[PDB]
Chains A and B, each alone.
With several copies, the nearest count.
Chain A
Amino acid sequence: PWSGYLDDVSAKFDTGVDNLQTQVTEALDKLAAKPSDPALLAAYQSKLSEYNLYRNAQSNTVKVFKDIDAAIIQNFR
């Protein structure tokens, strides 16, 4: 078991949004029972949007460091 650096960059986001990963599935499990409640719709719109942004920013950030590292390693020649 060996954590690299990219793993740490990712985990920074996971340990940032401490509970959002549960809140999304719990708000879904509320809503699916009674889809017509405005309070529940208003809640789930928010938590879903947040979860989208979080996963997107995480993946872009990992890609940029992957591209810096490769560009350095190509100069070892």
Chain B
Amino acid sequence: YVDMVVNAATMMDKQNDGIELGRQKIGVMRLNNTFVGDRTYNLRDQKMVIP
């Protein structure tokens, strides 16, 4: 019993390195009160930029 448990456990562990589960997901988030892009304005003698 002990010799079977230890071997099967170690091998299952080594095999699980092939399994991958941290799969990515995508979420679309609309903005309701502001523009999405960067904006540029001219000042007295220089530009100002808002990211």
Could you list which residues of chain A lie within 8 angstroms of chain B, going by C-beta atoms? Answer: 1-2, 5, 9-10, 13-16, 18-19, 22, 29-30, 33-34
A-B contacts, 21 of them at CB < 8 A, read: A1-B49, A1-B51, A2-B10, A5-B7, A9-B6, A9-B7, A10-B10, A10-B14, A13-B11, A14-B14, A15-B40, A15-B46, A16-B47, A18-B42, A18-B45, A22-B45, A29-B47, A30-B46, A33-B46, A33-B47, A34-B45
B44 in the interface (beta carbon within 8 A):
yes
Interface size on B, residues (CB 8 A): 13
Q: Which of B1-51 contact A (CB under 8 A)?
A: 6-7, 10-11, 14, 40, 42, 44-47, 49, 51
